[PDB]
């Protein structure tokens, strides 16, 4: 089922951002590396896939890369129009403890880090409803996140056989 991954149908909705609606179970290709539901789980998940020797504090680095990422891109980010905050007010809230990340931060971090990030959204059963890709990479090269329920994020590791 690797001919399935090299055939995903991504629709570019705006330059650099793609959407997909494939039919597969997250468990068929990824390993869920669970993250604490502490409100920083978005950043935990990134650290899990980008920082060797991850610890429960490594997420502070991702948040700081989000800071510089925001200084570069926040004012031109389409999804930033929905926050309705200055770069200063946004940076304060974003950097505050237990403030939760979102797709806005995924887009900016994709640019800052030079990576592709995919957020797979599921509804309870870990059956994928959709995927939002920030960057031009594919599923094998990207940082795959799992979004579940309301605001929780977990890390995904593509299995060794794919």
């Amino acid at each position: 089922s690797m001919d399935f991954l090299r055939s995903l149908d991504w629709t570019q909705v705006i330059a650099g951002q793609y959407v997909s609606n494939p039919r597969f179970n997250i468990s068929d290709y990824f390993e869920i590396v669970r993250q604490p539901g502490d409100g920083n789980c978005f950043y935990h998940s990134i650290a899990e896939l980008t920082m060797p020797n991850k610890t429960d504090h490594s997420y502070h680095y991702i948040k700081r890369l989000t800071e510089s990422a925001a200084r570069k891109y926040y004012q031109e980010e389409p999804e930033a129009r929905l926050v309705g905050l200055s770069l200063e007010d946004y940076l304060k809230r974003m950097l505050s403890d237990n403030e939760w990340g979102s797709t806005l931060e995924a887009s900016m971090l994709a640019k800052e880090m030079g990576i592709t990030i995919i957020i797979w959204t599921v509804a309870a059963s870990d059956e994928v409803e959709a995927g939002i890709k920030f960057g031009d990479g594919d599923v094998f090269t990207a940082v795959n996140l799992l979004h579940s329920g309301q605001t929780h994020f977990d890390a995904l590791r593509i299995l060794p056989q794919f």
Partner: protein, 75 residues
């Protein structure tokens, strides 16, 4: 006229709107049908995320146009 919105989940819905409708208005229509707070909706058309203050005629969205609804995920 009728315009199509392809939601994030994959299915397509229909909306009855006139060119004089605001983006904020259309978002309220989507919220009625799908129960999505407009704060989470990203309406996209012609590779552009549409802006609240403007209207469908500011973007030339005509009969049976296909719009994209991308959701803002994460609080």
């Amino acid at each position: 006229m009728q315009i199509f919105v392809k939601t994030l989940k994959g299915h397509v819905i229909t909306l009855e709107v006139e060119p004089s409708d605001t983006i904020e208005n259309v978002k309220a229509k989507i919220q009625d049908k799908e129960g999505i707070p407009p704060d989470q909706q990203r309406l996209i058309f012609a590779l552009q995320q549409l802006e609240d203050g403007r209207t469908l005629s500011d973007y030339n969205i005509q009969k049976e146009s296909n719009l994209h609804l991308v959701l803002r995920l994460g609080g």
